[PDB]
Amino acid sequence: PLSIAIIGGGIIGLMTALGLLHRNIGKVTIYERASAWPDIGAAFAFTGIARECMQRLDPAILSALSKVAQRNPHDKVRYWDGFHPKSKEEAQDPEKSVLFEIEEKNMAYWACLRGVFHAEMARLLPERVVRFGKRLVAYEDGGDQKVVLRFEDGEVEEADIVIACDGVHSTARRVLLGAEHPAANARYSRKAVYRALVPMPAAIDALGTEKAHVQIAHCGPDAHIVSFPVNNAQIYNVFLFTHDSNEWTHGHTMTVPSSKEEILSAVENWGPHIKELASLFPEQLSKYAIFDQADHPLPYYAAGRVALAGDAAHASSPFHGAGACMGVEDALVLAELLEKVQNKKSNIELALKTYSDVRIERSQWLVKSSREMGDLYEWRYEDIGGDGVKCKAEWERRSRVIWDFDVQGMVDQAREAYERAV
């Protein structure tokens, strides 16, 4: 019975494990470095396509999402100019200050918190699956015997198949390519995000009631803001994205403390309505650096009996929806290919190589485009600046690549490519 080891029990490793279990594939173990589930505060938007894939992995995943997720009641999102308005009245005037309007019905976002979603999937696993305190630090893959896994606690395990879902700073990715391969380390994208909860009446004062009661965006030079009423409208959530003209001075460390005054200087020259909104921010807050794999995409996702999936393979900026969206497609391809293997060593190798061959172009395209979408919202992308007609045309062309996609076609293409090679 195929021994399958999944490295890291994040969103994609859970989905990958649940997909293989749903199909009764081999024996599945998840090795998770942390002693218990890491507490990660993060907000996600899953596309309709991602949810199709969830449903094919294990319907209970989609049932779990649908009970914790919220959808925007309005399909249309207006992108407002936060920079040029000189008065609150100009800033609220849709005829003067709306750069463009996006119709999101095709993406069909569902928003949820990573923690609650992750927990709803965790309880779907049998207790025997997850092994905490198992930080993978190296492995040996070769010869006519299982992969040998080595953990930081001195223990050693073996597996026929390794799927590394160990995140943006994947250890398995560096073992696989070499710690000095250009693609071994994800890099700062130069976008950082600050988040804040602020009282609805203060938001109303700053933005006017019509803007504050719906999901909106504000664009401007080197920054953009996403903000929306929360739950029953007693509170207003603000997501402030900023470009960094400095390189990251911390390590792989992604959340660092910052003072409210980095925010204020970012929107120093913006309309009065954004300055006032930025003021409502706490004075200590956590800055989150967005790392991705745009500068040096991986040459491949698999070698021998080891495959990378999720952020370990294609960490992405969030401007086309969660980076996890592409990881869900990885998990589905992997489940469908390993089912073929079960129904040897060279079979395993071919499956993971097929996985890589079929997933790499679309997922690396997504890393590149979501990077560029962040620049567009911040008037840094090529010539376009703040031309709203050009930004809107870019949003529609890029999003169509994502949502206008044949999921069943992907499954059948991977299964057939495998069948021919075997």
Residues comprising the binding site for FAD?
32, 136, 311
Given candidates 311, 329, 372, 378, which one binds ligand FAD under the rule CB under 6 A?
Answer: 311
Strands 235-243 and 223-230: antiparallel
Q: Is the dihedral of CA 375, 380, 382, 388 positive or negative?
A: positive
Contacts to ligand FAD from residues 208-227, by CB under 6 A: none
User: Beta strands 161-164 and 235-243: pairing type?
Assistant: unpaired
Residue among 4, 5, 6, 12 that touches ligand FAD (CB under 6 A): 12
Instruction: Outline where 188-239 has alpha helix (H).
Output: 200-207, 209-212
Instruction: Specify the stretch interacting with ligand FAD by CB under 6 A; choose among 40-48, 217-225, 230-238, 349-357.
Output: 40-48
- The answer for 178, left when phi > 0, alpha when psi is -120 to 50, beta otherwise, is left
Distance of CA 221 to the CA centre of its chain: 24
Q: In the numeric block, which tokens belong to residue 187? A: 């890099």
Residue 398 sits in the site that holds ligand FAD (CB under 6 A): no
Residues followed by a break in the chain (C to N exceeding 2.5 Å) are: 343
Residue 33 binds to ligand FAD (criterion: CB under 6 A): yes
Using CB under 6 A, which residues numbered 123 to 142 contact ligand FAD? 135-136
Q: Going along 320-383, which residue ranges are E strands?
A: none
Buried/exposed 117-126: b ≥16 CB within 10 Å, e otherwise: bbebbbebbe
Residue 197 interacts with ligand FAD (CB under 6 A): yes or no: no
Q: Which residue number, 177 or 322, has a Cβ lying nearer to ligand FAD?
A: 322
Of the pair 273, 320, the CB lying nearest ligand FAD is at: 320
Size of the site for ligand FAD (CB under 6 A): 32
Candidates 85, 271, 327, 374; binder of ligand FAD (CB under 6 A) is 327
Residue 40 Cβ, how far from ligand FAD at the closest point, in Å? 5
Q: Which of 8, 85, 271, 374 binds ligand FAD (CB under 6 A)?
A: 8
Spacing of C-alpha 410 from chain mean position:
20
Rule CB under 6 A: which residues touch ligand FAD?
Answer: 7-12, 31-34, 38, 40, 42-44, 114, 135-136, 165-167, 171, 254-255, 288, 310-311, 318, 322-324, 327
